[PDB]
Coordinates of C-alpha atoms and ligand atoms in Angstrom, one line a residue:
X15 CA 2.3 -36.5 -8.1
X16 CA 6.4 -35.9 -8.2
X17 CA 7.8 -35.3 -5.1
X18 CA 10.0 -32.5 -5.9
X19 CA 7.1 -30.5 -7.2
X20 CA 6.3 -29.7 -3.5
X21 CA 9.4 -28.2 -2.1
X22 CA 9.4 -25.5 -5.2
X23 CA 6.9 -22.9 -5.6
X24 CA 5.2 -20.5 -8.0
X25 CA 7.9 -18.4 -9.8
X26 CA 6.3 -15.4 -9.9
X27 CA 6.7 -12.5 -7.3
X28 CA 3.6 -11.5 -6.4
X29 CA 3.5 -7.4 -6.7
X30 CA 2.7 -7.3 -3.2
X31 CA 6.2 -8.1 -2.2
X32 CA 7.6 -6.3 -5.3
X33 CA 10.0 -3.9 -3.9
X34 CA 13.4 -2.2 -5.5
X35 CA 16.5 -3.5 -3.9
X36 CA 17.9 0.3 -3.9
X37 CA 15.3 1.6 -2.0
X38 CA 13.0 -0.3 -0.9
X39 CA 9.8 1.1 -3.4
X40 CA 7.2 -0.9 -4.6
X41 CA 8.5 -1.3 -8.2
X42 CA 6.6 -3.4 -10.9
X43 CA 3.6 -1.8 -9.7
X50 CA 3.5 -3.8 -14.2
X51 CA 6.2 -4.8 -15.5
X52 CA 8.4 -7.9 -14.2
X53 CA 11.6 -6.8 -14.9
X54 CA 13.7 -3.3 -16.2
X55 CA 14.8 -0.3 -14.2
X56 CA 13.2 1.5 -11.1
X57 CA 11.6 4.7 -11.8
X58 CA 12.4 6.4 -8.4
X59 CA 16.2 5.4 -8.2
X60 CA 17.9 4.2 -12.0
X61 CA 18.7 0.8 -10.3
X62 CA 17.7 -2.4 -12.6
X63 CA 15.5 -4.9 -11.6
X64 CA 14.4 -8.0 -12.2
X65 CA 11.7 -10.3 -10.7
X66 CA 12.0 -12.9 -13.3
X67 CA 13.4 -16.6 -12.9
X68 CA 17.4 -16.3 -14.6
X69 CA 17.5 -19.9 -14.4
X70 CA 14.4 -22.1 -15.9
X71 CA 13.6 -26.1 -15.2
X72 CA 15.8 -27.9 -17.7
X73 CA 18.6 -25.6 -18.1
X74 CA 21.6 -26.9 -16.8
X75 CA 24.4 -25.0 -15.3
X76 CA 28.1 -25.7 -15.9
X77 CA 27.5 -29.0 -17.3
X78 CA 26.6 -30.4 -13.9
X79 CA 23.4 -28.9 -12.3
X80 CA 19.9 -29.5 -13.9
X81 CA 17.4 -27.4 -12.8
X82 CA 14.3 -28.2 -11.8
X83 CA 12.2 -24.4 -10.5
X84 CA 12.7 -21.8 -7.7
X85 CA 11.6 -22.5 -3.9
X86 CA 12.2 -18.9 -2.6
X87 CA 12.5 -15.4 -3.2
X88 CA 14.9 -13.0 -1.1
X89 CA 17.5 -10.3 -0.9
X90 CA 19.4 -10.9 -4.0
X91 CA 16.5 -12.8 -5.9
X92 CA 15.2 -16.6 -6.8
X93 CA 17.0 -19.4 -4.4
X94 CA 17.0 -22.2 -7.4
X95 CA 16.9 -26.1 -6.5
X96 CA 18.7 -28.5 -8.8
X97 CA 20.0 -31.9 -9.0
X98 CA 24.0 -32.4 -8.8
X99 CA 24.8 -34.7 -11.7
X100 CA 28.0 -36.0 -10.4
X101 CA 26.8 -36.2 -6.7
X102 CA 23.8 -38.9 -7.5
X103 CA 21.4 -36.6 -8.5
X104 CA 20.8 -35.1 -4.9
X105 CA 19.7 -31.7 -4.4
X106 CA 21.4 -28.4 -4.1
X107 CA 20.7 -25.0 -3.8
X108 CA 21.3 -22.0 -6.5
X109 CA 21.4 -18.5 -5.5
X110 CA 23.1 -15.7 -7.3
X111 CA 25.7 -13.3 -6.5
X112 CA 25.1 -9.6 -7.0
X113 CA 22.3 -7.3 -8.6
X114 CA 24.1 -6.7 -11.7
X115 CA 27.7 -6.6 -12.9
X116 CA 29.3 -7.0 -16.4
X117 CA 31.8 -9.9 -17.0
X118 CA 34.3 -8.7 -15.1
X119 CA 32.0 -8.0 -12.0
X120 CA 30.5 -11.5 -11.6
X121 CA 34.0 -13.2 -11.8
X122 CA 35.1 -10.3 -9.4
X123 CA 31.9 -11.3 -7.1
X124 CA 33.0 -15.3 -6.5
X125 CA 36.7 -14.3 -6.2
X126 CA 35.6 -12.3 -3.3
X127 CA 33.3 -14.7 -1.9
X128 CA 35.5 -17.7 -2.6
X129 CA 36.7 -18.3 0.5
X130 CA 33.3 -19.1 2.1
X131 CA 34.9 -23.1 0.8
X132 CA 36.4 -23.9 3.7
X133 CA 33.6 -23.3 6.4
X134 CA 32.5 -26.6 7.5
X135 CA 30.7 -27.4 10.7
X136 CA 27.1 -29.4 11.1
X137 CA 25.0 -26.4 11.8
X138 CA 26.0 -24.3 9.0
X139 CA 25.0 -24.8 5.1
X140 CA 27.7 -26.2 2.9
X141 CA 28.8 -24.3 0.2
X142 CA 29.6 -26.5 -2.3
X143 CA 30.8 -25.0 -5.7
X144 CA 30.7 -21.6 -7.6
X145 CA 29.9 -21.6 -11.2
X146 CA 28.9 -19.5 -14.1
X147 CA 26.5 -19.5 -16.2
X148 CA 26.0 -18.0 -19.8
X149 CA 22.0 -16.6 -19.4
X150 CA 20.0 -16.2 -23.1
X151 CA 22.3 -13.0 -23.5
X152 CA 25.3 -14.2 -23.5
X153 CA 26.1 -12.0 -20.5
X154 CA 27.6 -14.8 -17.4
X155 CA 25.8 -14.6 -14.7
X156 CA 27.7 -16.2 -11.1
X157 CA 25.6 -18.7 -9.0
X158 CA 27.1 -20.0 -5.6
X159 CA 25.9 -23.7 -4.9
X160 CA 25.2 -24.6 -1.5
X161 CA 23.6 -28.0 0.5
X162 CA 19.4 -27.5 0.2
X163 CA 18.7 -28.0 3.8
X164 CA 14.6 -28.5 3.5
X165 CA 12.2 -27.2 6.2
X166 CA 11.3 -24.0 7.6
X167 CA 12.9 -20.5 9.2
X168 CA 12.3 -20.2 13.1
X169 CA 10.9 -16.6 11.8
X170 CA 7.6 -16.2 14.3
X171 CA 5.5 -13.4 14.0
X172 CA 3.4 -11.7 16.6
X173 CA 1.0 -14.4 17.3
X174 CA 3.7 -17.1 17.3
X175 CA 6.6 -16.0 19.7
X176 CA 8.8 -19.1 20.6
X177 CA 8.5 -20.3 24.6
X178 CA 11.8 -19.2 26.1
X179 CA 12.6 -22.8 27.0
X180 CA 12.5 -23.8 23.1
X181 CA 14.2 -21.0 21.9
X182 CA 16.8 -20.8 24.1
X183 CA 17.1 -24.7 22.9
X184 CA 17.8 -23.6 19.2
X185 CA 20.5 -20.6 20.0
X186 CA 22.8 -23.2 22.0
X187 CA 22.5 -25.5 19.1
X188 CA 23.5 -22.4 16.9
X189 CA 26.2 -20.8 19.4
X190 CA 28.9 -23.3 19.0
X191 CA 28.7 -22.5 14.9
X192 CA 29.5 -18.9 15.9
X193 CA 32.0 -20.5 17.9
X194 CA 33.8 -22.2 15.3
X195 CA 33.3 -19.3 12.4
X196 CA 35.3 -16.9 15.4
X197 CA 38.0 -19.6 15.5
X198 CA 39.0 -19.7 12.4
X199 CA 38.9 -15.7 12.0
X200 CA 34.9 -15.2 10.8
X201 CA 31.8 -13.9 11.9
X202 CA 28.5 -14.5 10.6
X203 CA 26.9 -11.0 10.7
X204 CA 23.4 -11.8 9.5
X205 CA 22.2 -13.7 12.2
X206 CA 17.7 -13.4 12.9
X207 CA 15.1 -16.0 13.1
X208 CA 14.3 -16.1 9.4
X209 CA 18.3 -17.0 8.9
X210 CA 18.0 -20.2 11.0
X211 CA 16.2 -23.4 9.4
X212 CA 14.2 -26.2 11.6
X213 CA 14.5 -29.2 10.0
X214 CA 13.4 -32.8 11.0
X215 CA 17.1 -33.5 11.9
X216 CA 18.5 -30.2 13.3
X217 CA 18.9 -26.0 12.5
X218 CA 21.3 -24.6 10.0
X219 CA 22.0 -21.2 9.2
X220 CA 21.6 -20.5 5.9
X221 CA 22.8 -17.0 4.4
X222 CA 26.3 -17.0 4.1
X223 CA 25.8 -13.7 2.3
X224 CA 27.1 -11.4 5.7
X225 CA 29.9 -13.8 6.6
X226 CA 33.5 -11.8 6.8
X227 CA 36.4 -11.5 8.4
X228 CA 37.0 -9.8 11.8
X229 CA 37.7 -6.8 11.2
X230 CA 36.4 -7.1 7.4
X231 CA 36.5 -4.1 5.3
X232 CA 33.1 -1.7 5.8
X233 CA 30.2 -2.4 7.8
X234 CA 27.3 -3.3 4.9
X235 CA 27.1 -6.6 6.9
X236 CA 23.5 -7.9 8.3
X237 CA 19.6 -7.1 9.0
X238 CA 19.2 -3.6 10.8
X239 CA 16.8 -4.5 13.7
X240 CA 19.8 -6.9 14.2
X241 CA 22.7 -5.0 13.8
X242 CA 24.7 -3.6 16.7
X243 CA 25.3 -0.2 16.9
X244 CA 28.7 0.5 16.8
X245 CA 29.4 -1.5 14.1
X246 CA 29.6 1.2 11.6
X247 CA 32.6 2.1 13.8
X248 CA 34.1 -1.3 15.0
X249 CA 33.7 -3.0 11.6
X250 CA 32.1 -6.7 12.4
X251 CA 33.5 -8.6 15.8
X252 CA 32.6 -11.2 18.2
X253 CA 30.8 -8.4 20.4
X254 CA 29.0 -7.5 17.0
X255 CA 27.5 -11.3 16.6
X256 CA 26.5 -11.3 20.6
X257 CA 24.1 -8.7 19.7
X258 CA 22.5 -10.7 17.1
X259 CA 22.1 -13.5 19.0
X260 CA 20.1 -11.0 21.8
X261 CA 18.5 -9.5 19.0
X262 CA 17.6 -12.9 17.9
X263 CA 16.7 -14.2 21.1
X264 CA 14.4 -10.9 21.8
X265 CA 12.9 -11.8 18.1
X266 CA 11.9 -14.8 19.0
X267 CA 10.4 -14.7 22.5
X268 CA 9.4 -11.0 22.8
X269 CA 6.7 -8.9 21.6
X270 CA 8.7 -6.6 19.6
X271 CA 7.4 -3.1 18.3
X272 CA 8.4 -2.1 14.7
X273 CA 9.6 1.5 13.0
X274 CA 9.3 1.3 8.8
X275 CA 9.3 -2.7 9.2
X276 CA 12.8 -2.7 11.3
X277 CA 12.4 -3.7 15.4
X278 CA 12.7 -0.9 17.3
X279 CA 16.9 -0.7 19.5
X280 CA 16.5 -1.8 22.9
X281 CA 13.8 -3.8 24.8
X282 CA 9.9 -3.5 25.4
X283 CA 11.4 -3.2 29.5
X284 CA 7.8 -4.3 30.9
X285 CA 7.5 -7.4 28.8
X286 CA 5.5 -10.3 30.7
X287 CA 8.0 -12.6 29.6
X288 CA 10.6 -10.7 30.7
X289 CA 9.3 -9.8 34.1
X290 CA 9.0 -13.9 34.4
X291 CA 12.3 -14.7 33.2
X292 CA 14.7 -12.6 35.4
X293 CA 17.8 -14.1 34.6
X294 CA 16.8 -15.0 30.9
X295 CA 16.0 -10.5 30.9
X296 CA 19.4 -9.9 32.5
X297 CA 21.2 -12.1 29.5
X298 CA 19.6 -10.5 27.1
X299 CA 20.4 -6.7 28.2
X300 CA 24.0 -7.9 28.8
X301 CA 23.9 -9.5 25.1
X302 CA 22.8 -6.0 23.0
X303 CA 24.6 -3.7 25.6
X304 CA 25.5 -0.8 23.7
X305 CA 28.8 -0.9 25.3
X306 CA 30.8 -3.9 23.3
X307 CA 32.9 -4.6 26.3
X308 CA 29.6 -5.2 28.0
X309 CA 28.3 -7.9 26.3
X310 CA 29.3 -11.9 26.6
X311 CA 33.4 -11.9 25.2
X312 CA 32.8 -15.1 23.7
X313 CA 30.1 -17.3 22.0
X314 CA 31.4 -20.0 24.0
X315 CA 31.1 -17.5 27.3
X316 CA 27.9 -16.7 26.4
X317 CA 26.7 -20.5 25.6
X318 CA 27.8 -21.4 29.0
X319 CA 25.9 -18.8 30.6
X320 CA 22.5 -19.5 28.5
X321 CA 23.2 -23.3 29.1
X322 CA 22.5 -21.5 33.1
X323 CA 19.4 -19.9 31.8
X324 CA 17.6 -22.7 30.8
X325 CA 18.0 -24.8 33.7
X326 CA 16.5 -21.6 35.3
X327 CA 13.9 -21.4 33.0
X328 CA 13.6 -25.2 33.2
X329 CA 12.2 -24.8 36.5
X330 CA 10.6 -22.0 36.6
X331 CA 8.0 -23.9 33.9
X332 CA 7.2 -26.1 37.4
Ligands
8ZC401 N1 20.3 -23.5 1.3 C1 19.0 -23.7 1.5 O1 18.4 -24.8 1.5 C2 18.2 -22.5 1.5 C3 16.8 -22.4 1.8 N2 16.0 -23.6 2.1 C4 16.4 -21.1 1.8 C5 15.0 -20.5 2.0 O2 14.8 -19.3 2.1 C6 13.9 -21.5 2.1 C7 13.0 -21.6 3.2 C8 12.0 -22.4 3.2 C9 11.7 -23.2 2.1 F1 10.6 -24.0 2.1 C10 12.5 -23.1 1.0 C11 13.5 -22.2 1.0 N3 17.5 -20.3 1.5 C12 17.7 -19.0 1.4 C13 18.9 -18.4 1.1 C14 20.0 -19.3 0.9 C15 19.9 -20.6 1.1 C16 18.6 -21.2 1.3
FE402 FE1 14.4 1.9 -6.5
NA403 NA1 20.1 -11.1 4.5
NA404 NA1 28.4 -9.1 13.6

């Protein structure tokens, strides 16, 4: 029937995938929203935006088409822009008044990041929920298809995903020149569309050198980073980590991917040069590792045209 119907789903979490944000337990084991009885944290599961509502006098909208980290990723229609479609996604947990507006000051400067293969952020707004309370939304471009997450049975060919990084590498690229790094990089953070990939959660970007280290997926994460704060040696792991993720049959500790490599993997065994990139990309040294997106793009760019061949 209508079109848009289909890119939005059911908004309901289903209580298998009901989990505190705190800690991780399975809360609402029933109730959809209050406070988590193994940690005091509030919680809520609920849609904060419903279809009709319309949000700083300019987006309408129209249901929920995901559910993640920080809750329900709303679609809308911009109202000055011709109607198109943008995304919704809220800002923290909880905060009062002051704590929302706090949120988008911090988060602000995420404006001025443009290049092709990242999302546009477009506006932040606030909204007045039933409560009164104002609740901050960021709005961003709704870039439609699907993650390149793969599970077990669905590992990437090298060839292909060695494709997608050195369509993603030059965005790390650009976010390093102009003093950024995007912390959060994995397969389920990089969109296939019809057209090209995007990432898509802007929620790690920060500045090198950023204050703190509460930046990206463990599994992911580089080690030292806890130490280093975020750099450009901290994103090279990712994009091993991602590359590994995508190709390699990973083992798994409390749903996190294990440090390191599974060292006798076929695939690696076939790929020598494709195996060496990826030890040098999560070395646990920093200094290690590529210097450079750019460095590392060029020497990937290398490993395909190995891989290339090898595929007869
Ligand atoms: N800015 C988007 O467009 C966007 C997006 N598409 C998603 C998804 O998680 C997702 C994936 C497949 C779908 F079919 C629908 C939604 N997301 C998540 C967080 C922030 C932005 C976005
Ligand atoms: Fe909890
Ligand atoms: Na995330
Ligand atoms: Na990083």
């Amino acid at each position: 029937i209508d079109p848009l119907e289909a890119l939005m789903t059911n908004p309901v979490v289903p209580e298998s995938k009901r989990f505190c944000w705190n800690c991780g337990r399975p809360v609402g084991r029933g109730a959809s929203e209050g406070w988590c009885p193994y940690c005091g944290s509030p919680y809520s599961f609920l849609p904060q935006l419903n279809p009709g509502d319309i949000v700083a006098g300019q987006y309408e909208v129209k249901g929920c088409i995901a559910h993640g980290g920080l809750g329900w990723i709303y679609l809308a229609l911009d109202r000055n822009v011709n109607g198109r479609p943008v995304v919704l996604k809220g800002l923290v947990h909880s905060g009062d008044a002051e704590a929302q507006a706090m949120a988008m000051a911090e988060r602000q400067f995420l404006a001025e990041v443009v290049h092709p293969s990242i999302v546009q952020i477009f506006n932040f707004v606030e909204h007045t929920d039933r409560h009164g309370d104002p609740v901050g939304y960021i709005v961003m471009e709704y870039v439609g298809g699907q993650s390149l997450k793969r599970s077990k049975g669905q590992k990437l060919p090298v060839a292909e995903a060695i494709a997608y990084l050195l369509e993603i590498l030059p965005a790390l690229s650009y976010l390093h020149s102009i003093g950024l790094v995007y912390n959060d990089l994995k397969p389920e953070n990089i969109m296939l569309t019809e057209e090209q990939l995007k990432l898509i959660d802007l929620g790690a970007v920060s500045r090198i050198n950023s204050f703190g280290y509460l930046y990206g997926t463990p599994g992911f994460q580089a080690p030292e980073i806890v130490r280093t704060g975020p750099t450009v040696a901290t994103d090279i792991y990712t994009v091993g980590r991602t590359l590994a993720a995508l190709t390699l049959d990973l083992p798994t500790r409390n749903g996190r991917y294990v440090d390191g490599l599974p060292e006798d993997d076929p695939v690696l065994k076939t790929y020598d040069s494709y195996g060496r990139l990826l030890r040098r990309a999560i070395d646990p040294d920093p200094r290690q590792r590529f210097t450079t997106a750019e460095e590392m793009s060029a020497q990937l760019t290398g490993v395909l045209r190995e891989v290339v061949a090898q595929d007869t």
